[PDB]
Every structure is written in C-alpha cells, then in structure tokens.
C-alpha cells in the first residue's frame, strides 16, 4: 500500500497544471489524456471511503 | 531501392512463423483486422484492402506549424500520414479500446477527416544499426508510435487469436514496397481492367 | 546532422512573426560553424 | 520496499515549491512507459 501510494503521487505530480489546460497545449493535453486513461476514477472512490 | 512519397506500401508483420498483412475494410467495419500471406499457394489473400498510399511525411516538428496553421525520400525519425487507397480515407489511432481486459490498449482503425490529432505516426529504427536522419531502405525493421497517444501499433496474441493494437509494446514491421511511380499507358498489378476483343462477363449458380 | 538541426530550428520559429534577442544568437552560433564547415569542405576540393 | 526508494526521489523530480515542471514531466513519462513493467504488476490486471 506504501509502494502504491508512491506510484500514485508521482503522476499527480506530473500532471499538466491548469493553466496549460485553458490553452490548447495539444502536447499538454495529450499528456493528462494518458494518466486518465491509465487510472479508473471509481477505483479511487472506493480506497477514498 | 529507397522509399519515397506516394507510392503504395503494406505493412506485414512476422509471427510457426508467420507472415500477417493489415488490411481494413471502410464503409462498414472501420476498425482493422489482420489477414496472413504466408499461405499464398493454396488460398491467394485478398490485397484489395491492404494498400496504403504515403501521400504525405513530415518531420516532427515539421507538422507541428500545419496544426497551428513533390517526391520528397523519407527517413528515421520523421513523421507519415497513410492513405487507403481504395476507401480514399486516412489510417488513424481510434479513441475507443477493443481491448476490454483494462489493457490500455488502443484501437486501430479509419478516419475521414483529414485533421492532424491522431492520423500521424512516427517511425524508429529496431537496432543500433540506422539510426536518425538514415534513409529507410527496402526492407527494414520498423516501429511505429502514434503521435497523439504514443502507444506503438503492435500484434496482440492474448485475446485468443492475433489482432492489431495500439499499446505499450514495440513490434517489427517490414513496409515491403507494392507500387512506385508507374508509367502512363501500362499495366501494373491492382489494374482493374476489362479485357475487349465485347466484355468478358458472368451471369447476374453464376459460374 | 548540422542541416536537420538548423531547419528544425525553422520551424519553431515559421509561426512566430519577431525574433527576441537570444534566439539569434543561437541562430548566430550555428551559422558561424556552418561557414567554417564549408570553407573546410572547399579546402578538400579546391585542388583539382 | 526496493522500488519505493526510487519514486520518492523523483517526485522531488518534477515537484518543486508546489508546482510542477514542464520539461521533465514531459520525458518522465514518456520514458515510463516503455517499459511497463516499471508500473506496479496488477495494474499491468487486477
């Protein structure tokens, strides 16, 4: 769970910031394409509760 | 000896060994399927679906001014955009995944539009024999990565039996050249053609 | 491997209108090398 | 416990006073997967 907790917080921390989102940084964007298609999101939701 | 812009290729893979040509059918079923050569003798594959016309190629940073925005060899490290050239429609990267085993393994298959997101690939030499700025000879081994997904399209074997997908594994391709620049007046292979002397037709069990 | 390196630098720049101060003194340096290459390519064939 | 000895150094990698980088972020994960085994085994799934 340490192990996964690390590999987790890395990518949030290589996550496009926001501001590069509201322009179309088509290279910025391909980027948060890939870390949302990696991680299901209700996968979260059950280790969040 | 060395490739060039618009001429016809077909990309054949290798897996006993195995020779698979990709092909993709259009106008109904755009997602790509494979299709064997190696067993030519008693059954001829069907090629009609296989050519692929490079009506275009880039470098990399090259076609980033075309997004903001005539025979011309080709090499390692630079940019393609592929043609079907019976269904008049581009090779591309597809959002969906006919994977459904949370592989992340992306789906090939057709597009229309002639935007420039997912309809580009870029091609890397296998070994430390070429490198970049090397022209690619006939016959080589080639990866493909996407440029907006950058996943490589490669063969997959685990949902039974082979298909073609876009996913973190690299896999060789050979381009194997079908149809350069051929001359006016004569008669090349894929020529649909009548043969006169009066037609030479069938009947509309028809044999 | 100097030629594909000068024309990339190109099209960064084919979409921008003015050039900023360090931008041309890259572009400055790699000039400056290319006119000694040549020279030094000429020297191997001024001779006959 | 091996491999958690790495990642906690490259996140002061790309990470730094609350913000991310750029330019490293854009290689970092670009030379993350081609190597996937470099991700933890059942998400490579259960």
């Known amino acids: 769970m340490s192990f996964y907790a690390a590999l987790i917080d890395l990518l949030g921390r290589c996550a496009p910031e926001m501001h590069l989102i509201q322009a179309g940084k088509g290279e910025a964007l391909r980027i948060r394409a890939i870390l949302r298609s990696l991680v299901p999101l209700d996968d979260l939701v059950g280790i969040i509760s | 000896q060395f490739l060039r812009t618009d001429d016809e290729v077909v990309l054949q893979c290798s897996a006993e060994q195995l020779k698979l040509c990709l092909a993709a059918e259009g106008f109904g079923n755009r997602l790509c399927f494979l299709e064997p050569t190696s067993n030519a003798q008693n059954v001829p594959p069907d090629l009609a679906i296989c050519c692929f016309t490079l009506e275009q190629s880039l470098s990399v940073r090259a076609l980033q001014e075309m997004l903001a925005n005539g025979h ?12 079907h050239a019976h269904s008049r429609m581009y090779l591309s990267c597809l959002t969906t995944s006919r ?40 016959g080589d081994d080639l990866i493909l990565v996407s440029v907006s997904s950058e996943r490589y399209l490669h063969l997959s074997t685990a949902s039974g039996e082979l298909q073609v997908d876009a996913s973190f594994m690299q896999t060789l391709w050979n381009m194997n050249p079908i149809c350069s620049c051929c001359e006016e007046g004569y008669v090349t292979g894929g020529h649909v053609l009548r ?13 | 491997r100097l030629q594909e390196s000068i024309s990339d630098f190109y099209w960064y720049y084919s979409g921008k209108d003015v050039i900023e101060e360090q931008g041309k003194r890259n572009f400055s340096k ?12 000429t020297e191997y064939i001024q001779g006959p | 416990c091996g491999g958690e000895r790495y990642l906690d150094f490259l996140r002061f990698a790309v990470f730094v006073n609350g913000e991310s980088v750029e330019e490293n972020a854009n290689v970092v994960v670009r030379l993350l997967i ?4 470099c991700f933890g085994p059942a998400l490579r799934g259960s």
């Open chain 3, 30 to 41: 790699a000039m400056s090398v290319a006119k000694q290459v040549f020279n030094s390519l």
């Open chain 2, 195 to 207: 043969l006169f002397h009066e037609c030479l037709t069938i009947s509309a069990q028809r044999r």
């Open chain 2, 99 to 138: 994977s459904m085993t949370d592989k992340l393994a992306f789906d090939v298959g057709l597009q229309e539009d002639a935007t420039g997101e997912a309809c580009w690939w870029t091609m890397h030499p296998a070994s430390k024999q070429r490198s970049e700025g090397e022209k690619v000879r006939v």
């Open chain 2, 72 to 83: 011309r060899t080709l090499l390692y490290g630079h940019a393609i955009l592929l043609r």
């Open chain 4, 34 to 37: 081609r190597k996937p085994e």
